[PDB]
Amino acid sequence: MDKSELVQKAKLAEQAERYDDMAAAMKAVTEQGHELSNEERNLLSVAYKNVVGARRSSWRVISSIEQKTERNEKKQQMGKEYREKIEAELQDICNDVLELLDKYLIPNATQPESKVFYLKMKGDYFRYLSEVASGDNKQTTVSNSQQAYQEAFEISKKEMQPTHPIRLGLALNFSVFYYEILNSPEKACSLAKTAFDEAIAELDTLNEESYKDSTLIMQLLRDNLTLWTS
Amino acid sequence: MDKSELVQKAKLAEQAERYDDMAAAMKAVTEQGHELSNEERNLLSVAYKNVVGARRSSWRVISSIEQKTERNEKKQQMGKEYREKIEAELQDICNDVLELLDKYLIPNATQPESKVFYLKMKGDYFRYLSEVASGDNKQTTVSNSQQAYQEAFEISKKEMQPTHPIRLGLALNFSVFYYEILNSPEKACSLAKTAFDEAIAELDTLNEESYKDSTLIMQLLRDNLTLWTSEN
Amino acid sequence: GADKALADGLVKRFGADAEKYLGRQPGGIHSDAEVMALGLYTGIHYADLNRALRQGQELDAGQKLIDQGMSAAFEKSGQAEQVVKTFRGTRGGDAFNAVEEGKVGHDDGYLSTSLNPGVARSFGQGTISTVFGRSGIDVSGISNYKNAKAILYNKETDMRVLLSASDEQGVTRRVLEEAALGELSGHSQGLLDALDLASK
Ligand SMILES: NC(=O)c1ccc[n+]([C@@H]2C[C@H](COP(=O)(O)OP(=O)(O)OC[C@H]3O[C@@H](n4cnc5c(N)ncnc54)[C@H](O)[C@@H]3O)[C@@H](O)[C@H]2O)c1
């Protein structure tokens, strides 16, 4: 199918709140081999965010049930089989987007802003895999998440303003990775503190069209430091 | 597969907000041919309500888009193709529940309460088909909705209290059918008025288990009546 | 003890009027002072006591004893295991006229209700209410004119108005619930959601 045809189907599916349709439309647009516009990148991103986000929520609910309801071993098996069905779905989602990233998105990203975005995204979906993984498989994904986040971090610190919403958003998601996935309040607080401190030192770099985007992520990083050091 | 296994998977699916899984679990429980308990009936009902309800909402959104953007012929061909994909999903969901009703639910319904429930349900899903249908198929889906609602209405008026939540819920859904599907404010207001009047005449018939269920449906009945009849 | 004083005060104050209720409840949940106080109220003292209570007047010596015997009976009794459905009819005025649906209010006097609907219409056709509660006291064994089979609710007992409607005859039809029962009470688990109601 045509590029503008699938993009309109994705814009429609979004309005209809049919994100699995929205993601499949944008998967085909990506799988063609041509670099995505800022509009198409954001459509692919919000589509998979909701596709994966729904499975993450469902996983956090069934996992929370398994703990609080420990009696019938047949009930615990039903809970495990269902958690694992969602895990299978979660794994397949992240694989499909990590596949689109390595094969199409990251190689065709010309400008650094786009390269940071897709590398932060690679860190995100590897982190989503880490939440459900265990043992040796968990170790592989946590290391891949940290690497992809660090790669983007080094590119952003050299080719982007300290108040860039993609740089700040990366700082928030990377610090949360250290806090949730590596259980390091110290490393999480250090990333958030430095990122916030560097952004308030250079508020002059804010754009008059995307300053509210930056101040919002600068509030989420400020609320986390006060929450974590309480 | 076991009955209590699928029921637990459906209770899990409900918590996880995975209603397509919830409906599929309860579809299998129903296809076992054994009469559903009050718990199992409600699990099958909330499962399909959400499965169909999501497609109804998505259909009302894409249809609202088609109107406000009556421009490019390839853009309308995208909107129509997508509306029709959702329509096909709707017709497939409805058919599946109408199939469970005629083949398993309505024939195994012993007590009149559960019979009125399944007949109101048959009226509901035929009404959902009517919202997307056109022409000859519309005429048939509409007549089938009215018949199934009327069947349930006659059984409820004879074997159920005027305050029964299933009888009141039927009155609300049947009156809304007349208002939305047959565009009859007069027939809708008459059904709602009589049902509300008969329920406030016999508030003594309220059950100590479902009295708040009854008072809530009585408020929706009344609120519709004041909405349908009040001028600004 | 404080009860023995009251039981003595009540027969001192009301003589044979008080004494006629002694042993009327051989179940024995309530003391002689409580049984006599509820008796005195239910039989005839409801009129003057509820008037003093609703008007915020000083209770005379005799009114104070009945009120303190009833308050003590409600402290003892507390909440029951099952929810009860009672009925109530009023002529000219009602405590819950001033309460909008979903909101809670109370009567400053005691709320008399009946286990029989037909008995309630015989007390009034201004407003006929259906009550659901657990903290009421059954006095049908103490005083039972009209075979009213009365369940009394304590003074200032907070009730939530679940429905406040009117008849084509002009009778207000109310559904009250003891506000202490909660939000979960009166709902058959999963039913309302299963009913797939045609409203957003
Ligand atoms: N009304 C009933 O439905 C009912 C049911 C069962 C037993 N009883 C008994 C009947 C008898 C008296 O009770 P009842 O008639 O209910 O007493 P009441 O004191 O509560 O009512 C007398 C009349 O006063 C009016 N009134 C009531 N409440 C208010 C208020 N809050 N503000 C302004 N006016 C008000 C109203 O007109 C009512 O009919 C006792 O023997 C009770 O045991 C009454």
Curated annotation (Swiss-Prot), chain B:
It is found in: Cytoplasm; Melanosome; Vacuole membrane. GO terms for cellular component: cytoplasm; cytosol; extracellular exosome; focal adhesion; melanosome; membrane; nucleus; perinuclear region of cytoplasm. The record marks R56, R127 as: Interaction with phosphoserine on interacting protein. PROSITE patterns: 1433_1 (PS00796), 1433_2 (PS00797). InterPro entries: 14-3-3 (IPR000308), 14-3-3_CS (IPR023409), 14-3-3_dom_sf (IPR036815), 14-3-3_domain (IPR023410). Coiled coil: none annotated. The keyword Cytoplasm applies. The modification Phosphoserine is found at S58, S184, S230. The modification N6-acetyllysine is found at K3, K49, K68, K115. The modification 3'-nitrotyrosine is found at Y82, Y104. Its main location: cytoplasm. Signal peptide: none annotated. There is a cross-link at K49 (Glycyl lysine isopeptide (Lys-Gly) (interchain with G-Cter in SUMO2)). GO terms for biological process: negative regulation of DNA-templated transcription; negative regulation of G protein-coupled receptor signaling pathway; negative regulation of protein import into nucleus; positive regulation of transcription by RNA polymerase II; protein localization; protein targeting; signal transduction. Keywords: Acetylation, Cytoplasm, Host-virus interaction, Isopeptide bond, Membrane, Nitration, Phosphoprotein, Ubl conjugation, Vacuole. The alpha, brain-specific form differs from the beta form in being phosphorylated. Phosphorylated on Ser-58 by protein kinase C delta type catalytic subunit in a sphingosine-dependent fashion. One of its GO terms (molecular function) is protein domain specific binding. Homodimer. Interacts with SAMSN1 and PRKCE. Interacts with AKAP13. Interacts with SSH1 and TORC2/CRTC2. Interacts with ABL1; the interaction results in cytoplasmic location of ABL1 and inhibition of cABL-mediated apoptosis. Interacts with ROR2 (dimer); the interaction results in phosphorylation of YWHAB on tyrosine residues. Interacts with GAB2. Interacts with YAP1 (phosphorylated form). Interacts with the phosphorylated (by AKT1) form of SRPK2. Interacts with PKA-phosphorylated AANAT. Interacts with MYO1C. Interacts with SIRT2. Interacts with the 'Thr-369' phosphorylated form of DAPK2. (Microbial infection) Interacts with herpes simplex virus 1 protein UL46. Belongs to the 14-3-3 family. PANTHER family: 14-3-3 PROTEIN. Adapter protein implicated in the regulation of a large spectrum of both general and specialized signaling pathways. Binds to a large number of partners, usually by recognition of a phosphoserine or phosphothreonine motif. Binding generally results in the modulation of the activity of the binding partner. Negative regulator of osteogenesis. Blocks the nuclear translocation of the phosphorylated form (by AKT1) of SRPK2 and antagonizes its stimulatory effect on cyclin D1 expression resulting in blockage of neuronal apoptosis elicited by SRPK2. This is 14-3-3 protein beta/alpha. The gene is YWHAB.
